[PDB]
Design a protein around this motif. Structure first.
Motif, PDB file in Angstrom:
ATOM      1  N   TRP A  54       0.791  -1.195   0.000  1.00  0.00           N
ATOM      2  CA  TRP A  54       0.000   0.000   0.000  1.00  0.00           C
ATOM      3  C   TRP A  54       0.837   1.264   0.000  1.00  0.00           C
ATOM      4  O   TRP A  54       0.655   2.164  -0.852  1.00  0.00           O
ATOM      5  CB  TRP A  54      -0.986   0.004   1.210  1.00  0.00           C
ATOM      6  CG  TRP A  54      -1.815   1.239   1.213  1.00  0.00           C
ATOM      7  CD1 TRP A  54      -1.568   2.376   1.917  1.00  0.00           C
ATOM      8  CD2 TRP A  54      -2.970   1.510   0.430  1.00  0.00           C
ATOM      9  NE1 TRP A  54      -2.482   3.345   1.615  1.00  0.00           N
ATOM     10  CE2 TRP A  54      -3.390   2.824   0.744  1.00  0.00           C
ATOM     11  CE3 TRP A  54      -3.727   0.759  -0.473  1.00  0.00           C
ATOM     12  CZ2 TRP A  54      -4.517   3.431   0.130  1.00  0.00           C
ATOM     13  CZ3 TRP A  54      -4.873   1.372  -1.096  1.00  0.00           C
ATOM     14  CH2 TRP A  54      -5.234   2.666  -0.804  1.00  0.00           C
ATOM     15  N   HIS A  55       1.667   1.429   1.043  1.00  0.00           N
ATOM     16  CA  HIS A  55       2.524   2.611   1.054  1.00  0.00           C
ATOM     17  C   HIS A  55       3.585   2.541   0.013  1.00  0.00           C
ATOM     18  O   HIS A  55       4.114   1.488  -0.217  1.00  0.00           O
ATOM     19  CB  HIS A  55       3.157   2.870   2.415  1.00  0.00           C
ATOM     20  CG  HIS A  55       2.308   3.690   3.317  1.00  0.00           C
ATOM     21  ND1 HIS A  55       1.965   4.993   3.035  1.00  0.00           N
ATOM     22  CD2 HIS A  55       1.730   3.398   4.498  1.00  0.00           C
ATOM     23  CE1 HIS A  55       1.259   5.491   4.031  1.00  0.00           C
ATOM     24  NE2 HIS A  55       1.123   4.546   4.945  1.00  0.00           N
ATOM     25  N   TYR A  56       3.885   3.682  -0.599  1.00  0.00           N
ATOM     26  CA  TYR A  56       4.859   3.724  -1.684  1.00  0.00           C
ATOM     27  C   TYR A  56       6.280   3.799  -1.108  1.00  0.00           C
ATOM     28  O   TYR A  56       7.060   4.767  -1.380  1.00  0.00           O
ATOM     29  CB  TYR A  56       4.580   4.907  -2.616  1.00  0.00           C
ATOM     30  CG  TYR A  56       3.335   4.862  -3.489  1.00  0.00           C
ATOM     31  CD1 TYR A  56       2.344   3.895  -3.328  1.00  0.00           C
ATOM     32  CD2 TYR A  56       3.125   5.879  -4.461  1.00  0.00           C
ATOM     33  CE1 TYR A  56       1.166   3.911  -4.144  1.00  0.00           C
ATOM     34  CE2 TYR A  56       1.993   5.898  -5.273  1.00  0.00           C
ATOM     35  CZ  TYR A  56       1.005   4.953  -5.090  1.00  0.00           C
ATOM     36  OH  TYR A  56      -0.086   4.959  -5.905  1.00  0.00           O
ATOM     37  N   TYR A 115       7.733  21.325   4.230  1.00  0.00           N
ATOM     38  CA  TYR A 115       8.479  20.406   5.022  1.00  0.00           C
ATOM     39  C   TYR A 115       7.683  20.053   6.294  1.00  0.00           C
ATOM     40  O   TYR A 115       7.128  20.922   6.993  1.00  0.00           O
ATOM     41  CB  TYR A 115       9.829  20.990   5.323  1.00  0.00           C
ATOM     42  CG  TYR A 115      10.623  21.183   4.079  1.00  0.00           C
ATOM     43  CD1 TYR A 115      11.386  20.155   3.535  1.00  0.00           C
ATOM     44  CD2 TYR A 115      10.570  22.411   3.398  1.00  0.00           C
ATOM     45  CE1 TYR A 115      12.139  20.367   2.357  1.00  0.00           C
ATOM     46  CE2 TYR A 115      11.307  22.633   2.242  1.00  0.00           C
ATOM     47  CZ  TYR A 115      12.077  21.602   1.720  1.00  0.00           C
ATOM     48  OH  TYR A 115      12.762  21.859   0.580  1.00  0.00           O
ATOM     49  N   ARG A 116       7.625  18.772   6.575  1.00  0.00           N
ATOM     50  CA  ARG A 116       6.894  18.258   7.743  1.00  0.00           C
ATOM     51  C   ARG A 116       7.655  17.111   8.380  1.00  0.00           C
ATOM     52  O   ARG A 116       8.432  16.431   7.705  1.00  0.00           O
ATOM     53  CB  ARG A 116       5.521  17.714   7.356  1.00  0.00           C
ATOM     54  CG  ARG A 116       4.628  18.660   6.547  1.00  0.00           C
ATOM     55  CD  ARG A 116       3.415  17.935   5.963  1.00  0.00           C
ATOM     56  NE  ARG A 116       3.761  16.732   5.183  1.00  0.00           N
ATOM     57  CZ  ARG A 116       3.027  15.627   5.084  1.00  0.00           C
ATOM     58  NH1 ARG A 116       1.818  15.514   5.645  1.00  0.00           N
ATOM     59  NH2 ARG A 116       3.487  14.609   4.374  1.00  0.00           N
ATOM     60  N   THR A 117       7.415  16.941   9.673  1.00  0.00           N
ATOM     61  CA  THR A 117       7.682  15.706  10.371  1.00  0.00           C
ATOM     62  C   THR A 117       6.419  14.847  10.361  1.00  0.00           C
ATOM     63  O   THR A 117       5.298  15.339  10.615  1.00  0.00           O
ATOM     64  CB  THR A 117       7.889  15.966  11.855  1.00  0.00           C
ATOM     65  OG1 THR A 117       6.686  16.586  12.328  1.00  0.00           O
ATOM     66  CG2 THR A 117       9.096  16.802  12.136  1.00  0.00           C
ATOM     67  N   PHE A 172      12.297   4.951   2.680  1.00  0.00           N
ATOM     68  CA  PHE A 172      12.204   5.939   1.613  1.00  0.00           C
ATOM     69  C   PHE A 172      10.803   5.784   1.018  1.00  0.00           C
ATOM     70  O   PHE A 172      10.314   4.676   0.880  1.00  0.00           O
ATOM     71  CB  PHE A 172      13.259   5.715   0.564  1.00  0.00           C
ATOM     72  CG  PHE A 172      14.632   5.508   1.138  1.00  0.00           C
ATOM     73  CD1 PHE A 172      14.988   4.273   1.642  1.00  0.00           C
ATOM     74  CD2 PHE A 172      15.540   6.540   1.197  1.00  0.00           C
ATOM     75  CE1 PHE A 172      16.269   4.078   2.145  1.00  0.00           C
ATOM     76  CE2 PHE A 172      16.798   6.364   1.721  1.00  0.00           C
ATOM     77  CZ  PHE A 172      17.158   5.132   2.203  1.00  0.00           C
ATOM     78  N   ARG A 173      10.145   6.918   0.785  1.00  0.00           N
ATOM     79  CA  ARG A 173       8.782   6.980   0.227  1.00  0.00           C
ATOM     80  C   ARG A 173       8.761   8.064  -0.787  1.00  0.00           C
ATOM     81  O   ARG A 173       9.239   9.166  -0.505  1.00  0.00           O
ATOM     82  CB  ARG A 173       7.773   7.280   1.325  1.00  0.00           C
ATOM     83  CG  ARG A 173       6.337   6.969   0.960  1.00  0.00           C
ATOM     84  CD  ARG A 173       5.399   7.454   2.062  1.00  0.00           C
ATOM     85  NE  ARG A 173       5.061   8.839   1.972  1.00  0.00           N
ATOM     86  CZ  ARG A 173       4.258   9.490   2.809  1.00  0.00           C
ATOM     87  NH1 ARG A 173       3.673   8.901   3.876  1.00  0.00           N
ATOM     88  NH2 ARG A 173       4.028  10.754   2.573  1.00  0.00           N
ATOM     89  N   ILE A 174       8.242   7.765  -1.976  1.00  0.00           N
ATOM     90  CA  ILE A 174       7.931   8.768  -3.018  1.00  0.00           C
ATOM     91  C   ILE A 174       6.495   8.581  -3.539  1.00  0.00           C
ATOM     92  O   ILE A 174       6.081   7.439  -3.759  1.00  0.00           O
ATOM     93  CB  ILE A 174       9.001   8.818  -4.130  1.00  0.00           C
ATOM     94  CG1 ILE A 174       9.245   7.487  -4.862  1.00  0.00           C
ATOM     95  CG2 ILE A 174      10.293   9.311  -3.446  1.00  0.00           C
ATOM     96  CD1 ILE A 174      10.078   7.552  -6.168  1.00  0.00           C
TER      97      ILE A 174
END
Ligand code: H6P
Length: 186
Positions: A54-56, A115-117, A172-174
């Motif tokens: 599911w998550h990229y 930019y976020r945490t 790592f996520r894109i």
């Protein structure tokens, strides 16, 4: 800069290669196993247990259970990305919100300039200059994960005093389809 002069004195340089078995089938891992891109459509791959379905997302090949470690990631002019560490045992099948309580310690960029945490709730970061290359630093025993602008040493963010119980992988996520990949530096 002190950043470049000291990083290796203080943290062991991790040689991070991306594990194609973990990668969401919408992701392509380069041959050198240092860069990731996104396809228009999910590629035809198995739904083996290690894969994020599911998550990229994609993980490093190796995890950490102690010590001090770092790696650097060229984000370049990408408009969207998130990087950090996660627990070995995160939920990889179906959705979970990417948060420390779900075993993810990440930050990044969305919509080009936000930019976020990835905390609950998300919190916004205020960065003087956009970074091109980001250093990710883990100290397992103190519990700190810190992010720096790799080119000038400036601090971006620190998750403080996390009590880790599992092995930790680089993650790592894109989400987006853009010309520029996300690339690990050796
Ligand atoms: C659909 C998707 C990611 C977006 O997750 P969320 O919708 O939970 O948002 P974020 O705050 O950026 O984590 C694939 O990884």
């Amino acid at each position: 800069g002190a950043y470049n002069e000291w990083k290796k004195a203080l943290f062991k340089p991790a040689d991070v290669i991306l594990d194609p078995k973990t990668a969401n089938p919408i992701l392509l891992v380069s041959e050198d196993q240092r860069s990731v891109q996104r396809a228009k459509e999910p590629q035809d791959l198995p739904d083996n247990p290690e894969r994020f379905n599911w998550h990229y997302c994609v993980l490093g090949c190796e995890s950490f259970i102690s010590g001090r470690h770092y790696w650097e990631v060229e984000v370049g002019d990408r408009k969207e990305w998130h990087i950090g560490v996660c627990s070995k045992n995160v939920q990889r099948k179906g959705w979970v919100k990417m948060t420390p309580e779900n075993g993810f310690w990440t930050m990044g960029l969305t919509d080009g300039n936000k930019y976020r945490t990835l905390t609950e709730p998300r919190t916004n970061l205020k960065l003087p200059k956009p970074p091109k290359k980001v250093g990710v630093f883990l100290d397992y025993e103190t519990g700190d994960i810190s992010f720096y602008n790799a080119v000038d040493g400036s601090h971006i963010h620190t998750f403080l005093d996390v009590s880790f119980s599992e092995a930790l992988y680089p993650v790592f996520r894109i989400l987006t389809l853009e010309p520029t990949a996300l690339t690990i530096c050796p």
